[PDB]
Short mmCIF file of C-alpha atoms and ligand atoms in Angstrom, two decimals:
data_model
loop_
_atom_site.label_atom_id
_atom_site.label_comp_id
_atom_site.label_asym_id
_atom_site.label_seq_id
_atom_site.Cartn_x
_atom_site.Cartn_y
_atom_site.Cartn_z
CA UNK N 1 -0.01 0.03 -0.03
CA UNK N 2 1.87 3.07 1.41
CA UNK N 3 5.50 3.74 0.48
CA UNK N 4 6.91 6.47 2.54
CA UNK N 5 10.37 7.98 2.21
CA UNK N 6 12.00 9.29 5.38
CA UNK N 7 15.16 11.27 5.15
CA UNK N 8 18.03 11.00 7.67
CA UNK N 9 17.71 14.66 8.82
CA UNK N 10 14.30 13.69 10.31
CA UNK N 11 14.79 12.97 14.11
CA UNK N 12 14.12 9.44 15.41
CA UNK N 13 11.30 10.74 17.60
CA UNK N 14 9.92 12.68 14.57
CA UNK N 15 9.87 9.31 12.68
CA UNK N 16 8.10 7.46 15.41
CA UNK N 17 5.48 10.34 15.73
CA UNK N 18 5.07 10.00 11.97
CA UNK N 19 5.20 6.17 12.24
CA UNK N 20 2.52 5.78 15.06
CA UNK N 21 -0.12 8.12 13.39
CA UNK N 22 0.16 6.16 10.05
CA UNK N 23 -0.49 2.90 11.95
CA UNK N 24 -3.83 4.28 13.07
CA UNK N 25 -5.08 4.52 9.54
CA UNK N 26 -3.32 2.28 6.93
CA UNK N 27 -2.48 -1.45 7.86
CA UNK N 28 0.39 -2.00 5.35
CA UNK N 29 3.25 0.63 5.52
CA UNK N 30 6.76 0.66 3.87
CA UNK N 31 9.44 3.09 5.32
CA UNK N 32 12.49 3.96 3.23
CA UNK N 33 15.63 5.88 4.31
CA UNK N 34 17.76 8.20 2.21
CA UNK N 35 20.19 11.14 2.40
CA UNK N 36 18.59 14.50 2.31
CA UNK N 37 20.66 15.00 -0.86
CA UNK N 38 18.91 11.98 -2.52
CA UNK N 39 15.38 12.24 -1.16
CA UNK N 40 13.68 14.37 -4.05
CA UNK N 41 15.71 12.51 -6.85
CA UNK N 42 14.36 9.31 -5.32
CA UNK N 43 10.60 10.32 -5.41
CA UNK N 44 10.98 11.72 -8.91
CA UNK N 45 11.72 8.20 -10.29
CA UNK N 46 8.42 6.79 -11.51
CA UNK N 47 9.67 3.18 -10.89
CA UNK N 48 10.24 4.03 -7.21
CA UNK N 49 6.34 4.59 -6.69
CA UNK N 50 6.76 6.68 -3.49
CA UNK N 51 3.62 8.21 -2.08
CA UNK N 52 4.86 10.41 0.73
CA UNK N 53 8.36 12.06 1.33
CA UNK N 54 9.30 13.52 4.59
CA UNK N 55 12.48 15.56 4.01
CA UNK N 56 14.28 18.91 4.51
CA UNK N 57 15.22 19.48 0.97
CA UNK N 58 13.12 22.10 -0.83
CA UNK N 59 11.77 22.58 -4.40
CA UNK N 60 8.87 24.58 -6.16
CA UNK N 61 6.77 23.17 -8.90
CA UNK N 62 7.19 19.33 -8.89
CA UNK N 63 5.55 16.88 -11.25
CA UNK N 64 2.58 15.00 -9.85
CA UNK N 65 3.67 15.95 -6.26
CA UNK N 66 2.06 18.33 -3.71
CA UNK N 67 3.99 20.17 -0.84
CA UNK N 68 3.31 21.23 2.75
CA UNK N 69 5.15 22.19 5.97
CA UNK N 70 4.98 19.41 8.55
CA UNK N 71 7.08 21.25 11.09
CA UNK N 72 10.50 22.55 12.07
CA UNK N 73 13.74 21.01 13.37
CA UNK N 74 17.25 22.22 14.29
CA UNK N 75 20.76 21.81 12.71
CA UNK N 76 24.05 22.91 14.11
CA UNK N 77 27.33 24.04 12.30
CA UNK N 78 29.98 21.98 14.09
CA UNK N 79 33.80 21.38 14.29
CA UNK N 80 36.52 19.92 16.51
CA UNK N 81 37.02 22.24 19.72
CA UNK N 82 40.75 22.89 18.85
CA UNK N 83 39.81 23.71 15.07
CA UNK N 84 40.86 27.34 14.25
CA UNK N 85 37.18 28.33 13.68
CA UNK N 86 36.40 27.93 17.34
CA UNK N 87 39.47 29.99 18.62
CA UNK N 88 37.93 33.10 16.81
CA UNK N 89 34.56 34.96 16.31
CA UNK N 90 32.60 33.68 13.32
CA UNK N 91 30.52 36.66 11.79
CA UNK N 92 30.29 35.66 8.11
CA UNK N 93 29.68 32.62 5.69
CA UNK N 94 32.91 33.85 4.05
CA UNK N 95 34.93 33.15 7.10
CA UNK N 96 33.74 29.49 6.96
CA UNK N 97 34.46 29.43 3.22
CA UNK N 98 38.28 29.67 3.96
CA UNK N 99 38.23 26.28 5.58
CA UNK N 100 37.10 22.96 4.39
CA UNK N 101 33.33 21.64 4.40
CA UNK N 102 32.39 18.17 4.93
CA UNK N 103 29.02 17.78 2.91
CA UNK N 104 26.71 15.08 1.95
CA UNK N 105 27.13 14.21 -1.78
CA UNK N 106 24.28 13.21 -3.99
CA UNK N 107 24.13 10.38 -6.51
CA UNK N 108 23.13 13.01 -9.23
CA UNK N 109 26.11 15.40 -8.52
CA UNK N 110 23.94 18.49 -8.18
CA UNK N 111 22.29 19.99 -5.01
CA UNK N 112 19.47 22.39 -4.23
CA UNK N 113 19.94 26.03 -2.93
CA UNK N 114 19.51 24.72 0.60
CA UNK N 115 22.06 21.78 0.57
CA UNK N 116 24.72 23.20 -1.79
CA UNK N 117 28.07 23.37 -0.06
CA UNK N 118 28.83 26.93 0.91
CA UNK N 119 32.74 26.48 0.75
CA UNK N 120 35.30 26.55 -2.00
CA UNK N 121 37.10 23.66 -0.28
CA UNK N 122 34.73 20.74 -0.12
CA UNK N 123 34.94 17.04 0.81
CA UNK N 124 31.82 14.92 -0.07
CA UNK N 125 30.59 12.07 2.09
CA UNK N 126 27.51 9.70 1.82
CA UNK N 127 25.95 9.99 5.44
CA UNK N 128 26.06 12.09 8.64
CA UNK N 129 28.02 9.27 10.29
CA UNK N 130 30.94 9.57 7.80
CA UNK N 131 30.66 13.42 8.07
CA UNK N 132 30.98 13.54 11.77
CA UNK N 133 33.88 11.09 11.87
CA UNK N 134 35.96 13.35 9.61
CA UNK N 135 34.87 16.41 11.74
CA UNK N 136 35.66 14.71 15.11
CA UNK N 137 39.10 13.97 13.85
CA UNK N 138 39.55 17.70 12.97
CA UNK N 139 39.34 17.52 9.27
CA UNK N 140 36.63 20.18 8.40
CA UNK N 141 33.39 21.77 9.48
CA UNK N 142 29.91 20.31 8.89
CA UNK N 143 26.17 21.14 9.45
CA UNK N 144 24.35 18.15 10.85
CA UNK N 145 21.04 17.47 12.75
CA UNK N 146 20.67 18.03 16.44
CA UNK N 147 20.14 14.29 17.27
CA UNK N 148 23.52 13.36 15.50
CA UNK N 149 25.58 15.84 17.44
CA UNK N 150 23.77 15.90 20.73
CA UNK N 151 25.84 13.51 22.93
CA UNK N 152 29.14 14.81 21.54
CA UNK N 153 28.43 18.46 22.39
CA UNK N 154 27.85 17.30 26.10
CA UNK N 155 31.08 15.20 25.95
CA UNK N 156 33.10 18.15 24.44
CA UNK N 157 34.06 16.06 21.45
CA UNK N 158 32.57 18.85 19.15
CA UNK N 159 32.04 22.59 19.50
CA UNK N 160 29.08 24.57 17.88
CA UNK N 161 29.97 27.16 15.42
CA UNK N 162 26.46 28.57 14.57
CA UNK N 163 25.49 30.07 17.87
CA UNK N 164 25.97 33.75 17.15
CA UNK N 165 24.37 33.19 13.74
CA UNK N 166 21.21 31.43 14.84
CA UNK N 167 21.05 30.83 18.71
CA UNK N 168 19.18 27.57 19.58
CA UNK N 169 20.26 25.90 16.26
CA UNK N 170 19.64 26.52 12.56
CA UNK N 171 15.76 26.26 12.21
CA UNK N 172 14.81 24.16 9.31
CA UNK N 173 11.62 23.31 7.73
CA UNK N 174 10.46 19.72 7.42
CA UNK N 175 8.40 19.33 4.23
CA UNK N 176 6.10 16.63 3.34
CA UNK N 177 5.82 16.03 -0.41
CA UNK N 178 2.96 13.87 -1.34
CA UNK N 179 1.28 12.11 -4.29
CA UNK N 180 -1.69 13.97 -5.69
CA UNK N 181 -4.02 10.97 -5.09
CA UNK N 182 -3.71 11.51 -1.32
CA UNK N 183 -5.40 15.04 -1.61
CA UNK N 184 -8.76 13.50 -1.14
CA UNK N 185 -8.17 10.71 1.53
CA UNK N 186 -9.56 11.73 5.01
CA UNK N 187 -6.94 9.28 6.43
CA UNK N 188 -4.08 11.48 4.96
CA UNK N 189 -5.51 14.76 6.23
CA UNK N 190 -6.03 13.04 9.53
CA UNK N 191 -2.25 11.91 9.35
CA UNK N 192 -1.20 15.63 8.50
CA UNK N 193 -3.35 17.06 11.30
CA UNK N 194 -2.13 14.60 13.92
CA UNK N 195 1.40 14.49 12.68
CA UNK N 196 1.64 18.30 13.01
CA UNK N 197 -0.25 18.51 16.25
CA UNK N 198 2.14 16.14 17.82
CA UNK N 199 5.29 17.52 16.09
CA UNK N 200 4.52 20.85 17.66
CA UNK N 201 4.25 19.32 21.13
CA UNK N 202 7.85 17.73 20.90
CA UNK D 1 28.54 55.22 17.87
CA UNK D 2 26.23 56.75 15.22
CA UNK D 3 23.95 54.46 13.28
CA UNK D 4 21.91 54.56 10.09
CA UNK D 5 19.72 51.52 10.04
CA UNK D 6 17.48 50.07 7.33
CA UNK D 7 14.33 47.93 8.21
CA UNK D 8 12.22 46.48 5.31
CA UNK D 9 8.29 46.75 5.23
CA UNK D 10 7.83 42.98 5.92
CA UNK D 11 8.99 43.57 9.52
CA UNK D 12 5.97 44.23 11.65
CA UNK D 13 5.68 47.39 13.74
CA UNK D 14 6.22 45.76 17.16
CA UNK D 15 9.24 44.04 15.77
CA UNK D 16 10.50 47.30 14.30
CA UNK D 17 9.71 49.25 17.54
CA UNK D 18 11.51 46.60 19.60
CA UNK D 19 14.71 46.84 17.50
CA UNK D 20 14.49 50.65 17.68
CA UNK D 21 14.09 50.50 21.32
CA UNK D 22 17.38 48.46 21.89
CA UNK D 23 19.50 50.39 19.27
CA UNK D 24 18.64 53.81 21.03
CA UNK D 25 19.69 52.21 24.33
CA UNK D 26 23.09 50.98 23.10
CA UNK D 27 23.99 53.63 20.65
CA UNK D 28 23.49 57.40 20.67
CA UNK D 29 22.08 58.82 17.29
CA UNK D 30 20.11 56.46 15.26
CA UNK D 31 18.45 56.89 11.80
CA UNK D 32 15.83 54.72 10.07
CA UNK D 33 15.12 54.00 6.41
CA UNK D 34 12.17 51.84 5.22
CA UNK D 35 12.15 49.98 1.85
CA UNK D 36 10.46 47.06 0.22
CA UNK D 37 12.12 43.70 1.09
CA UNK D 38 12.91 43.36 -2.77
CA UNK D 39 14.92 46.62 -2.54
CA UNK D 40 16.64 46.40 0.90
CA UNK D 41 19.96 44.68 -0.14
CA UNK D 42 20.39 46.68 -3.29
CA UNK D 43 20.03 49.82 -1.24
CA UNK D 44 22.67 48.98 1.41
CA UNK D 45 25.27 47.93 -1.44
CA UNK D 46 25.28 51.45 -2.91
CA UNK D 47 28.38 53.69 -2.41
CA UNK D 48 27.00 56.89 -0.73
CA UNK D 49 24.11 54.95 1.15
CA UNK D 50 26.20 54.53 4.40
CA UNK D 51 23.71 52.24 6.13
CA UNK D 52 25.43 50.33 8.98
CA UNK D 53 22.66 47.61 9.71
CA UNK D 54 19.80 46.18 7.57
CA UNK D 55 16.94 44.11 9.05
CA UNK D 56 15.15 42.30 6.28
CA UNK D 57 13.65 39.04 5.13
CA UNK D 58 15.78 39.04 1.94
CA UNK D 59 18.59 36.59 1.43
CA UNK D 60 21.75 36.67 -0.52
CA UNK D 61 24.60 34.70 1.10
CA UNK D 62 28.15 36.17 0.39
CA UNK D 63 28.19 38.91 -2.39
CA UNK D 64 28.99 41.71 0.08
CA UNK D 65 31.16 43.38 2.75
CA UNK D 66 28.20 42.67 5.21
CA UNK D 67 28.09 39.91 7.88
CA UNK D 68 24.83 38.03 8.36
CA UNK D 69 22.73 36.62 11.18
CA UNK D 70 19.22 35.71 12.16
CA UNK D 71 17.54 38.28 14.45
CA UNK D 72 14.07 36.59 14.52
CA UNK D 73 11.13 35.17 12.66
CA UNK D 74 8.06 36.55 11.13
CA UNK D 75 4.73 35.08 9.42
CA UNK D 76 3.52 35.73 5.82
CA UNK D 77 0.04 34.78 4.32
CA UNK D 78 -0.97 33.84 0.74
CA UNK D 79 -4.08 35.84 0.27
CA UNK D 80 -6.84 36.36 -2.28
CA UNK D 81 -10.34 37.92 -2.87
CA UNK D 82 -12.91 35.64 -1.00
CA UNK D 83 -14.54 34.68 -4.31
CA UNK D 84 -11.84 33.98 -6.85
CA UNK D 85 -11.26 30.42 -8.15
CA UNK D 86 -8.55 29.51 -5.62
CA UNK D 87 -11.06 29.71 -2.72
CA UNK D 88 -13.79 27.47 -4.20
CA UNK D 89 -11.60 24.42 -4.06
CA UNK D 90 -8.65 23.05 -2.06
CA UNK D 91 -5.01 24.06 -2.90
CA UNK D 92 -2.12 21.75 -2.34
CA UNK D 93 0.73 22.86 -4.56
CA UNK D 94 2.51 25.60 -6.46
CA UNK D 95 0.94 24.37 -9.67
CA UNK D 96 -2.56 25.63 -8.57
CA UNK D 97 -1.25 29.06 -7.78
CA UNK D 98 0.89 29.15 -10.94
CA UNK D 99 -2.42 28.86 -12.89
CA UNK D 100 -3.15 32.57 -11.87
CA UNK D 101 -1.70 36.02 -11.51
CA UNK D 102 0.68 36.60 -8.73
CA UNK D 103 0.94 40.21 -7.64
CA UNK D 104 4.64 40.32 -6.67
CA UNK D 105 6.84 43.15 -5.39
CA UNK D 106 9.14 44.27 -8.18
CA UNK D 107 12.80 45.55 -7.72
CA UNK D 108 14.33 48.69 -9.01
CA UNK D 109 17.51 46.53 -10.02
CA UNK D 110 15.34 44.11 -12.04
CA UNK D 111 16.67 40.83 -10.27
CA UNK D 112 15.29 38.89 -7.44
CA UNK D 113 16.57 36.53 -4.69
CA UNK D 114 15.54 32.87 -4.60
CA UNK D 115 13.22 33.85 -1.76
CA UNK D 116 11.39 36.79 -3.36
CA UNK D 117 11.17 35.54 -7.03
CA UNK D 118 7.59 35.08 -8.16
CA UNK D 119 6.39 31.37 -8.31
CA UNK D 120 3.76 31.88 -11.11
CA UNK D 121 4.54 32.70 -14.72
CA UNK D 122 1.52 35.04 -15.00
CA UNK D 123 2.90 37.87 -12.90
CA UNK D 124 2.23 41.52 -12.27
CA UNK D 125 4.89 43.66 -10.48
CA UNK D 126 4.00 46.42 -7.91
CA UNK D 127 6.41 48.78 -5.72
CA UNK D 128 4.76 48.10 -2.24
CA UNK D 129 2.40 46.06 -0.36
CA UNK D 130 -0.34 48.66 -0.34
CA UNK D 131 -0.54 48.50 -4.04
CA UNK D 132 -0.40 44.72 -3.98
CA UNK D 133 -3.41 44.39 -1.72
CA UNK D 134 -5.32 47.09 -3.75
CA UNK D 135 -5.11 44.76 -6.74
CA UNK D 136 -5.90 41.60 -4.58
CA UNK D 137 -8.80 43.22 -2.94
CA UNK D 138 -10.11 44.11 -6.50
CA UNK D 139 -9.88 40.51 -7.55
CA UNK D 140 -6.93 40.77 -9.95
CA UNK D 141 -4.72 38.00 -8.53
CA UNK D 142 -3.26 36.31 -5.36
CA UNK D 143 -0.37 37.73 -3.32
CA UNK D 144 1.97 36.97 -0.35
CA UNK D 145 2.13 39.63 2.40
CA UNK D 146 2.82 39.95 6.00
CA UNK D 147 0.23 39.26 8.86
CA UNK D 148 -0.06 42.98 9.93
CA UNK D 149 -0.82 44.21 6.35
CA UNK D 150 -3.79 41.74 6.03
CA UNK D 151 -5.04 41.28 9.73
CA UNK D 152 -7.87 43.78 9.57
CA UNK D 153 -8.98 42.82 5.93
CA UNK D 154 -9.02 39.02 6.73
CA UNK D 155 -11.37 39.43 9.95
CA UNK D 156 -13.77 41.66 7.81
CA UNK D 157 -13.94 39.09 5.10
CA UNK D 158 -12.31 41.55 2.64
CA UNK D 159 -9.64 38.98 2.05
CA UNK D 160 -9.06 35.27 2.36
CA UNK D 161 -6.12 33.11 3.37
CA UNK D 162 -5.05 30.34 0.91
CA UNK D 163 -2.13 29.07 2.95
CA UNK D 164 -3.40 27.31 6.02
CA UNK D 165 -3.37 23.88 4.56
CA UNK D 166 0.26 24.37 3.31
CA UNK D 167 1.66 25.97 6.69
CA UNK D 168 -0.79 26.50 9.47
CA UNK D 169 -0.32 29.85 11.35
CA UNK D 170 1.31 31.42 8.26
CA UNK D 171 4.48 30.91 6.24
CA UNK D 172 7.45 31.21 8.67
CA UNK D 173 10.15 33.46 7.52
CA UNK D 174 13.51 34.38 8.91
CA UNK D 175 14.36 37.91 9.66
CA UNK D 176 18.06 38.55 9.01
CA UNK D 177 20.25 41.30 10.41
CA UNK D 178 23.03 42.23 7.88
CA UNK D 179 25.72 44.38 9.57
CA UNK D 180 28.83 46.39 8.82
CA UNK D 181 32.23 44.63 9.13
CA UNK D 182 33.14 47.60 11.56
CA UNK D 183 30.38 46.65 14.06
CA UNK D 184 31.58 42.99 14.50
CA UNK D 185 34.18 44.06 17.18
CA UNK D 186 31.91 46.50 19.22
CA UNK D 187 30.45 45.29 22.52
CA UNK D 188 27.39 47.61 21.96
CA UNK D 189 26.51 45.66 18.92
CA UNK D 190 26.78 42.37 20.58
CA UNK D 191 24.77 43.62 23.46
CA UNK D 192 22.22 44.88 21.10
CA UNK D 193 22.10 41.48 19.55
CA UNK D 194 21.50 39.58 22.85
CA UNK D 195 18.94 42.14 24.02
CA UNK D 196 16.92 42.45 20.93
CA UNK D 197 16.82 38.61 20.35
CA UNK D 198 15.55 37.99 23.86
CA UNK D 199 12.89 40.77 23.59
CA UNK D 200 11.87 39.54 20.11
CA UNK D 201 11.36 36.05 21.51
CA UNK D 202 9.23 37.58 24.34
CA UNK D 203 6.74 39.02 21.61
O1 CZG G 1 26.23 24.44 4.74
C1 CZG G 1 25.12 24.87 4.22
C2 CZG G 1 24.72 24.02 3.01
S1 CZG G 1 24.54 22.36 3.40
C3 CZG G 1 23.24 21.95 4.63
N1 CZG G 1 23.06 20.83 5.20
C4 CZG G 1 22.09 20.99 6.03
C5 CZG G 1 21.60 20.10 6.95
C6 CZG G 1 20.45 20.49 7.74
N2 CZG G 1 19.94 19.55 8.68
O2 CZG G 1 20.47 18.63 9.07
O3 CZG G 1 18.83 19.75 9.19
C7 CZG G 1 19.93 21.76 7.52
C8 CZG G 1 20.48 22.75 6.70
C9 CZG G 1 21.59 22.28 5.83
N3 CZG G 1 22.39 22.98 4.99
N4 CZG G 1 24.46 26.02 4.68
C10 CZG G 1 24.76 26.74 5.81
C11 CZG G 1 23.82 27.17 6.49
C12 CZG G 1 24.07 27.95 7.81
C13 CZG G 1 25.32 28.23 8.09
O4 CZG G 1 25.47 28.98 9.41
C14 CZG G 1 26.41 29.92 9.48
C15 CZG G 1 27.21 29.93 10.62
C16 CZG G 1 28.05 30.91 10.84
C17 CZG G 1 28.21 31.85 10.05
C18 CZG G 1 27.32 32.05 8.92
C19 CZG G 1 26.52 31.00 8.55
C20 CZG G 1 26.38 27.70 7.33
C21 CZG G 1 26.09 27.08 6.16
O1 CZG G 2 5.68 33.59 -3.81
C1 CZG G 2 6.74 33.36 -3.16
C2 CZG G 2 7.94 34.15 -3.53
S1 CZG G 2 7.63 35.88 -3.08
C3 CZG G 2 7.63 36.11 -1.27
N1 CZG G 2 7.21 37.27 -0.77
C4 CZG G 2 7.27 37.14 0.68
C5 CZG G 2 6.93 37.87 1.71
C6 CZG G 2 7.01 37.57 2.98
N2 CZG G 2 6.68 38.43 4.05
O2 CZG G 2 6.15 39.61 3.83
O3 CZG G 2 6.89 38.21 5.29
C7 CZG G 2 7.68 36.29 3.35
C8 CZG G 2 7.93 35.37 2.21
C9 CZG G 2 7.79 35.79 0.95
N3 CZG G 2 8.00 35.15 -0.31
N4 CZG G 2 6.86 32.18 -2.32
C10 CZG G 2 5.78 31.47 -1.88
C11 CZG G 2 5.71 31.03 -0.54
C12 CZG G 2 4.77 30.23 -0.06
C13 CZG G 2 3.68 29.83 -0.79
O4 CZG G 2 2.84 29.12 -0.17
C14 CZG G 2 1.82 28.16 -0.61
C15 CZG G 2 0.44 28.43 -0.48
C16 CZG G 2 -0.48 27.41 -0.94
C17 CZG G 2 0.05 26.38 -1.70
C18 CZG G 2 1.48 26.26 -1.85
C19 CZG G 2 2.39 27.20 -1.43
C20 CZG G 2 3.49 30.37 -2.04
C21 CZG G 2 4.52 31.09 -2.66
#
């Protein structure tokens, strides 16, 4: 029945709040995980047959796909505590651009405005695990979800760099892209309503 | 010390007045200038403009001697005349909106950022929000405008909201503070940031 793509920037709790609400309406449900850099390329494939996509990546007029804001989540710009960016005030994007960025690569090679690397010096990886291993080791800087960097910010294994830019983290819209068939279904609007209502309350 | 500050017209009055309040507390001698969001960045990048700070919803990333940060958040609404085809039906995507005339803010430069560029291909450019809503009131198209510009007309039934299904409570929008490289070292500016941010969160 319902193929649902979830993106790895969506928090585990955010998934289970999405998971549960679907259980109340649908019986059969497939959950699929991708990088945020591959999420919108995945749904665009016809042969993938994906009904819903919950991701942070953004686009305007998509073929056969509606769009809505499901809620918000936080990302943090991070680096090793002894990395030169820490021992320094960080007022611009062009200050970060002097140093190397560890970004997610896509299978296509291109990125959206939101996910395109902001640096001249760039090193691509395929998941946030790989990204943070490099960053922990002192190689570059990266932007990653709160849940991926939470434990290490308490440990002092990483430092936050984005805190004068946007205190509390970099607020990020979580979109829901959905197949146009799902416009009508009362079960889907219920899903939307109860997903949102609960995602606010986290 | 002395400051010339730009604030765009998408920033609501209580947000403007809060920012005014803190600046006058931390600096002596402040000046204000108001512009369309679509002309805010092009204004501060002029030679003889001498604007030290710009508080605006428009985005650029790089391309300037100005530092960037996020001062706060603000809500916009997609609106239309209560009749008009878009109301007598549901509305899930850009495709539906792109079948009708957008009344967009136009820039004097000619260009637009990714944020402010019109989504439809049937488009009609105005120079401010007053003019946008005059055409929207009259039934000519749809537009996106701040809450405080449409608050009174929405409760009258003069306008209707087309964007509650897409983003309940309004389309959330970051308010950026662009600032002079000279200000980055000054304690008064950092105090200003801390105080304004906390007061803005309290609104
Ligand atoms: O790096 C990028 C492009 S890749 C990207 N990956 C993301 C992951 C997520 N997520 O996991 O939720 C969200 C957004 C992402 N964007 N943008 C970028 C945004 C803000 C910054 O903050 C600054 C800090 C100091 C001074 C100036 C700016 C720096 C860079
Ligand atoms: O039209 C634009 C670009 S121009 C623009 N002017 C702005 C003013 C403000 N402000 O005053 O605060 C803020 C953002 C602006 N962006 N974006 C756009 C955003 C969301 C929409 O919502 C939908 C509604 C129904 C179904 C699908 C989507 C539609 C269009």
